[PDB]
Design a protein around this ligand. Structure first.
Ligand SMILES: *[C@@H]1O[C@H](CO)[C@@H](O)[C@H](O)[C@H]1NC(C)=O
Lengths: 38, 47
């Protein structure tokens, strides 16, 4: 709760900072989720 | 209406990395063979 993530590679549905997807910048989610790192 | 002109109609599974079209989602847990993302993996196993 002290590291604020930006995108985390999740699916996108007043405009947020994630409007870089429309210009071709897509963030991929990691293979190992946090439930597996835990 | 779509730039990719091929057609793929099969079992649909929704992951947090995207939609997986072409693979069945079993309930077992095996070693990761082909990584996809967001936890799940893919493999070529018999039944
Ligand atoms: C995807 O579509 C479903 C069906 O309406 C919806 O419930 C869900 O919130 C949407 N987004 C994600 C990230 O699954």
């Amino acid at each position: 709760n002290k590291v604020t993530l930006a995108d985390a590679g999740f699916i996108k549905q007043r405009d947020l900072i994630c409007a870089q997807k429309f210009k071709g910048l897509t963030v991929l989610p990691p293979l190992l989720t946090d439930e597996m790192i835990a | 209406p779509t730039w990719r002109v091929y057609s793929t109609g099969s079992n649909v599974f929704q992951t947090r990395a995207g939609c997986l079209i072409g693979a069945e989602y079993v309930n077992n847990s095996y070693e990761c063979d082909i990584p996809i993302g967001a936890g799940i993996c893919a493999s070529y196993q018999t039944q």
